Structure 1
């Protein structure tokens, strides 16, 4: 019961890092063999870090607008001593180029494993909106 809390804590940390534009921080939580389905891949299965490094260097760098993220009804499956899965709904509140409020939704899955006594994210599937807020 206590193990579900630390998956949600770790997941929160990861999302924080991304919104902060901290590539250094992000690289410590992801497995170096990470794979992902996301809208920016145009239906392709991407693998490794360097496809993502572009957005941390050229988009997230300029992040100045106020933002808020809410995680709704997380379901955690624990499937060994060192293995976990989480499914959740994500709401992001942001302000657009007109100065008006906006909200966008994505539905998301992450898979976790614990090599060397540290949790690492090995896979990610993002659906509905992209990871960055929709336009």
Structure 2
């Protein structure tokens, strides 16, 4: 039932990214966040320092989160797997859609949920 708890937090995180609000992002991510993602060229990154770059140095877009499946593991742990559709407008003016498969693992540290691990493909 409180699977919807996770989905909301995931949605809030993606919202922060799309806004370039790094302070908002950091709040929701654990400081020791590990990340597999295309931009890391097949490396695992201690992904708080690595992600700053994309905020500090950066159009209309709409993110959609399909078939979010949440595994719950006792009081303080859960993981979410979901397809992220991103509608945007290419420089050449045309509208385009792009798909990513995303896995976010969540730990509740004192009341709030934290994202500790992130795996993105696409």
What is the TM-score normalised by the length of structure 1? 0.87
Moved >3 Å (runs of 4+): none
Indicate the residue corresponding to 1:121 in structure 2: 115
Gaps of 5+ in 2: none
- Distance, in Å, in 1 between the alignment partners of 2:67 and 2:110 is 30
Offset at residue 48 of structure 1 (A): 4.1
| d(CA) in 2 for partners of 1:48, 1:121 | 11
Mind listing any 5+ residue stretches in structure 1 that lack a counterpart? Answer: 59-64, 129-135
Number of matched pairs = 120
CA–CA separation in structure 1 for the residues paired with 2:110 and 2:100: 32
Deviation at 1:115, TM superposition (A): 1.4
RMSD: 0.7
Q: Please, what TM-score do these two structures have when normalized by structure 2?
A: 0.96
Q: Give the distance between the partners of 2:95 and 2:25, measured in 1 at CA.
A: 28
Structure 1 residues 16 and 78, CA gap change in structure 2 (3 angstroms): same
